[PDB]
Structure formats: C-alpha cells, structure tokens
Design a protein around this ligand. Structure first.
Ligand SMILES: [Zn+2]
Length: 197
C-alpha cells in the first residue's frame, strides 16, 4: 500500500482554435510538462478558448466548454481530476451512461452557447482541426456529408458539433464506420448536458 499510486489528472495540452476563418490545432504543453502536470495536478498555463486538447497517459482527446463547464467523454477521462492552477479539480458531473463528464471550466476559458437555432446543419470539429459538415438525423446522431476515414476522427471525442452560427449542439462521442469509413456520428446533445446540470 505504501507504493500504491493515484491516477494522474487530465492535462490540457493544447487547443482547437476556431476564432478565425481557419481552424487549427495549437500545442501548449509538450510531453514532459504533460507528465509532470498530470502527477502534481498543478497547471499554471493560461487556458484560452472553447475547445481544449486534453491528455491522459494513454489518450489524447478534446474537451469543450459549454455553460461554464468543461465537458468531455467518460471513455477518455474516466473519473479523473483535471490539472488546474490550484491543483487537481474533481469532476462536477460524471455519467458513464451518457459517456459524459464535466469539470468547472478553467478560469480564462470561453464557453460556447447552446444552440437556439433549431439547426440540423451541423459541423463536427476534430482534434486535427478539420471542420466536417454533418446533417443531424435524430436526438443524438448525424450523418457525415463528406466521408472521412474513422482513423481521422481519433481523439475527437469530447469535441463539439456546432451549428452554422457557431453555437454548441452537442459533444461528439463516437463514429459509425463501414469498411473503415465514418458515415455517421453519435453525440451527446446539449439538452442532455443541461439536464445533467
Ligand atoms: Zn445555433
């Protein structure tokens, strides 16, 4: 028991910048700093924007701020704390059944607003900063209008589905693939987030 360790914190290691006419990924922490920060839970880096790239020891994925909470998928983060300026921060919300977790959003981050457009014309934002058009087909599913290999969506879970105006419609959870090609996406709708809150 003396040698028993705690799980590391989730660490913010970059962001998906959607502020211009061009989407792009930025790294803010390399692997050494990520490892250190995961162990201490102390992250003194300034966080900015809506969509963060987060990492554990085994996965790199996305987390999206909506209504002042930084949301991601349970299959990425599990029950982990997130590193912060004040030390490790415990989850505010944990729901394995929805594949959804959330922490209070980092100081200096920006939150997306939930979509009030009633829009079914969506855009998926990926960990590689691709913006992929998606037509919504139900509460929690949409079809890719432009096929991608499923490998191209690796680490996009936790990122947003946006409406044409840039409002949050949902959090990407998982893709449906045929012969390696993603044809549809499953997501956690923003209403489900609101209910959890
Ligand atoms: Zn909207």
């Amino acid at each position: 028991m003396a040698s028993m360790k705690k799980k590391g914190s989730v660490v913010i290691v970059g962001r998906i910048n959607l502020s211009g006419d061009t989407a792009y990924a930025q790294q803010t922490r390399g692997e050494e700093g990520c490892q250190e920060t995961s162990q201490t839970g102390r992250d003194k880096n300034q966080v900015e924007g809506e969509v963060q790239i987060v990492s554990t020891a085994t996965q790199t994925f996305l987390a999206t701020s909506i209504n002042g909470v930084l949301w991601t998928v349970y299959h990425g983060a599990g029950t982990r704390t997130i590193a912060s300026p004040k030390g490790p921060v415990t989850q505010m919300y944990t729901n394995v059944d929805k594949d959804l977790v959330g922490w209070q959003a980092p100081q200096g981050s920006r939150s997306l607003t939930p979509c009030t457009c009633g829009s079914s014309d969506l855009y998926l934002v990926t960990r590689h900063a691709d913006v992929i058009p998606v037509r919504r087909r139900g509460d929690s599913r949409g079809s890719l209008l432009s096929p991608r290999p499923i490998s191209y969506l690796k680490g996009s879970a936790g990122g947003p589905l946006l409406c044409p105006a840039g409002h949050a419609v949902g959090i990407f959870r998982a893709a449906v693939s045929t012969r390696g090609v993603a044809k549809a996406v499953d997501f956690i709708p923003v209403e489900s987030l609101e209910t959890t809150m």
